[PDB]
Design a protein around this ligand. Structure first.
Ligand SMILES: N[C@H]1CC[C@H](S(=O)(=O)N2[C@@H]3CC[C@H]2C[C@@H](NC(=O)c2cc(C4CC4)on2)C3)CC1
Ligand SMILES: C[S@@+](CC[C@H](N)C(=O)[O-])C[C@H]1O[C@@H](n2cnc3c(N)ncnc32)[C@H](O)[C@@H]1O
Ligand SMILES: [Zn+2]
Ligand SMILES: [Zn+2]
Ligand SMILES: [Zn+2]
Length: 424
């Protein structure tokens, strides 16, 4: 039976609230996407279907754009790929914005597929569009997306009979911008984008009582605090390493709302996030645009070189609790992990631990993963007692944020045994 229900809130549209008391770690809902796709930078790096990396992928011949880890995935993806197959091939050699490819798959699922389990509580038809709050600048962008879609899909969709009844593309893209989820892999690297309309009922908080976590394209919604009957369920839509000014900008620009939460009212943690010389972190913030782009395209050598020039600069340096320094350390760590520079990865990862404890309070999946990464690095360098402490700490977080339904927990259970067997 459902532990959650749809309801009309006072001033934030529809929401989700608890029907029964909920405990930390309790599974509230699970869902495959209505539609999803690989994100721009991970295209040809991860499998289109399962969103896992592999040394070399098998590309679809029949369009030769979609890439797969296995014949299993390539064949199982064919139903939701066949029509975009015809389109991507016409397109060739142009690649569309992620939102266009995503909406393509939405339209095909709605036209050709059975009614989706992802739409149990709330459907794509029901999603918030915020059309009456859109600026003229944003509307212009949405008009370009509509024309991009029309061009991209001109092989498969020529008239209104091939869209759902009274389907409006402008409105559809408006729904996509404020309801799309960035799908992250087990390592918290961005790999996809998808729509999960039942999960779209959840409103935002900068200090939420629930969290989502991805296992491939599959999404698990879990409570991360005690929640009373009737209490609204919230998730944090945003990266935790953001100031209240930065959160304000994005929640306005993307989500068309003004956040009234305590953290936003008091600028909670902003001062600590911006410690160090302002001239220096301004330069690093600017440098991170390139670093993050390079990371998004899995260019670890270049990511590392840029991060090293900051972390071990011959000029002024920043404290590790500075959010821009902290992002640089994290990017450097993941680069070192993927270049097999494991000692250097551990130096960076270790340095992120205390800042992550502060900036990811309570039970947050991103901290759980970070601690697991540091524990895993220590385990494999034979630092068996420090590793056990971190892997147990990672488990205490991840038992709440991931749970037994997530396959990463099974991996973590094995590392507890493996590390436990070497010392204890
Ligand atoms: N380097 C960091 C970047 C951010 C991620 S994250 O896990 O913190 N991240 C996820 C969830 C929150 C934040 C930003 C993204 N958020 C969403 O995609 C999203 C969208 C929604 C609602 C439909 C609008 O709720 N969450 C992806 C960890 C690694
Ligand atoms: C993913 S939806 C959430 C469900 C939405 N309330 C609905 O009725 O469908 C995102 C939209 O909900 C609204 N929203 C989410 N969190 C909010 C908050 N803390 N305050 C005000 N509005 C919020 C905004 O309109 C936002 O663009
Ligand atoms: Zn696969
Ligand atoms: Zn194809
Ligand atoms: Zn807030």
């Amino acid at each position: 039976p459902l532990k959650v229900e749809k309801f009309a809130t006072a001033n934030r549209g529809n929401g989700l609230r608890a029907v029964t008391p909920l405990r930390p770690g309790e599974l509230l809902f699970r869902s495959d996407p209505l539609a999803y796709t690989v994100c721009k930078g991970s295209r040809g790096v991860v499998c289109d279907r399962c969103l896992l990396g592999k040394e070399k992928l098998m590309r679809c011949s029949q369009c030769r754009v979609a890439k797969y880890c296995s014949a299993k995935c390539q064949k199982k993806a064919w139903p939701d790929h066949k029509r975009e197959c015809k389109c991507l091939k016409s397109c060739k050699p142009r690649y569309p914005p992620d939102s266009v490819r995503l909406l393509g798959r939405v339209v095909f699922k709605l036209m050709d597929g059975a009614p989706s389990e992802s739409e149990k509580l709330y459907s794509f038809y029901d999603l918030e569009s915020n059309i009456n709050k859109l600026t003229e600048d944003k509307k212009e962008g949405l008009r370009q997306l509509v024309m991009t879609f029309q061009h991209f899909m001109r092989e498969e969709i020529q008239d209104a009979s091939q869209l759902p009844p009274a389907f409006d593309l402008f409105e559809a893209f408006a729904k996509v911008i404020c309801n799309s989820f960035t799908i992250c892999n087990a390592e918290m690297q961005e790999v996809g984008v998808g729509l999960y309309p039942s999960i779209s009922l959840l409103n935002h908080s900068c200090d939420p009582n629930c969290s989502i976590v991805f296992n491939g394209p599959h999404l698990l919604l879990r409570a991360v605090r005690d929640i009373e009957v009737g209490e609204e369920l919230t998730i944090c839509y945003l990266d935790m390493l953001m100031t209240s000014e930065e959160r304000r900008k994005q929640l306005r620009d993307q989500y068309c709302f003004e956040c009234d939460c305590f953290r936003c009212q008091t600028q909670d943690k902003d001062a600590d996030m911006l410690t160090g010389d302002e001239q220096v972190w301004k330069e690093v913030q600017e440098s991170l645009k390139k670093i993050e782009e390079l990371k998004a395209h899995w260019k670890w050598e270049q990511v590392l070189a840029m991060c090293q020039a900051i972390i071990s600069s011959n000029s002024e340096r920043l404290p590790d609790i500075n959010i821009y320094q902290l992002k640089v350390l994290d990017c450097a760590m993941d680069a070192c992990i993927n270049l097999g520079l494991l000692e250097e990865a551990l130096f960076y990862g270790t340095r992120t631990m205390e800042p992550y404890r502060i900036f990811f309070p309570g039970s947050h999946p991103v901290r759980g993963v970070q601690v697991m990464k540091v524990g895993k690095l220590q385990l494999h360098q034979g630092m068996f007692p420090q590793a056990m402490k971190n892997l147990r700490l990672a488990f205490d977080i991840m038992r709440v944020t991931h749970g037994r339904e997530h396959s990463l927990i099974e991996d973590l259970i094995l590392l507890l045994e493996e590390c436990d067997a070497n010392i204890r």
